[PDB]
């Protein structure tokens, strides 16, 4: 992701077939002539999409121009959470399924995986970062405290940001409860709150290289969201 000072980002297309699929997804959802109510509602939860972009001298080099969801924040605290029971897609080979399950074999049980976090600490005027191995090390026993870490800012547990996140995720859950046309694998939620010196959160869906047509509820995604909501709710009792 390349952050631009105009409030947008450029996301380089992943190698094929993943990049091309993600392009196709953004093009479908944001089709100017689209009047599908499911897709019009979905736009609210995605970064705004400004089309394919390449450098003036390099039409080979393909990016998505997207809204920078952290732009309105001063000291953004950011967490990326992969959602679902399966991070492989319906056409994955045996090898690929094994590859994906082995990356985090608790995916089926927990239904989400923390990809990373960046947390502003007021006392030190600095950021604490956690990489992909942080989330992959969390179990049923440590997931609550693992998620809690994201909200430790300003000398306190930020229960305002926790509650706002639940409220925002609930709207995304409601969208999933009311569509049976897309299933999302290896997709994420990006959480942002203000770390600088209340209740102000962004939650957006990102990462769409494995979104497929469906005729059922996305049950794995729903499971993950619900479990994430339940974990966040338990953090409100701390
Ligand atoms: C502070 O820099 C970050 C920016 C982002 C970021 O990621 C995106 C990923 C997408 O697939 C689409 C996006 O629109 C964003 C985004 O806007 C963003 O700020 C994520 C983590 C970060 O540490």
Resolution, Å (one decimal): 1.8
Mutational test site, ligand 1, from 6, 69, 202, max ligand atoms within 8 Å of CB = 69
Q: Is the CB of 10 under 6 A from ligand 1?
A: no
* Domain with 214 in it: 1-238
Report whether 157 contacts 148 (CB < 8 A): yes
CA dist 202 and 30 (Å) reads 20
Nearest-5° Cα angle at 225, 128 to 93: 95
Which of 179, 166, 167, 139 minimizes the C-alpha distance to 229?
Answer: 166
Q: Is the CB of 11 under 6 A from ligand 1?
A: yes
Overall domain count for the chain: 1
Q: Is the CB of 42 under 6 A from ligand 1?
A: no
Instruction: Tell me: is residue 80 an annotated ligand-binding position.
Output: yes
For residue 231, give every residue at least 6 positions away whose Cβ sits within 8 Å of its Cβ, in sequence order, or none. 143, 144, 147
44 Cα–ligand 1 center, Å: 16
Instruction: Tell me: is residue 85 an annotated ligand-binding position.
Output: no
Question: Experimental method for this entry?
Answer: X-ray
CA dist 114 and 126 (Å) reads 21
């Amino acid at each position: 992701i390349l952050q631009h000072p105009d409030g947008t980002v450029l996301k380089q297309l992943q190698p094929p077939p993943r990049g091309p699929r993600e392009l196709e997804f953004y093009n479908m959802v944001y089709a100017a002539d689209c009047f599908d109510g499911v897709l019009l509602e979905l736009r609210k939860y995605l970064p705004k999409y400004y089309g394919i972009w390449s450098p003036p001298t390099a039409p080979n080099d393909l990016y998505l121009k997207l809204e920078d969801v952290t732009h309105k924040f001063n000291k953004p605290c950011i967490m990326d959470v992969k959602i679902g029971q399966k991070s492989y897609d319906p056409f994955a080979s045996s090898e690929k399924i094994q590859q994906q399950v082995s990356k985090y074999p608790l995916m089926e049980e927990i239904g989400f995986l923390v990809l990373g976090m960046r947390v502003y600490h007021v006392h030190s005027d600095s950021y604490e970062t956690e990489n992909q191995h942080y989330g992959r090390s969390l179990t049923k026993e440590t997931i609550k405290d693992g998620v809690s870490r994201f909200f430790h800012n300003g000398y306190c547990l930020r229960k305002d940001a926790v509650a706002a996140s639940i409220q925002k995720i609930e709207k995304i859950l409601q969208w999933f409860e009311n569509q049976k046309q897309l299933n999302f694998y290896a997709s994420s939620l990006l959480f942002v709150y203000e770390g600088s010196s209340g209740g102000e959160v962004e939650v957006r869906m990102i990462d769409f290289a494995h979104v497929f047509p469906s005729n059922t509820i996305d049950e794995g995604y729903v499971y993950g969201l619900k479990h994430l909501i339940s974990v966040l709710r338990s953090i409100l009792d701390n």
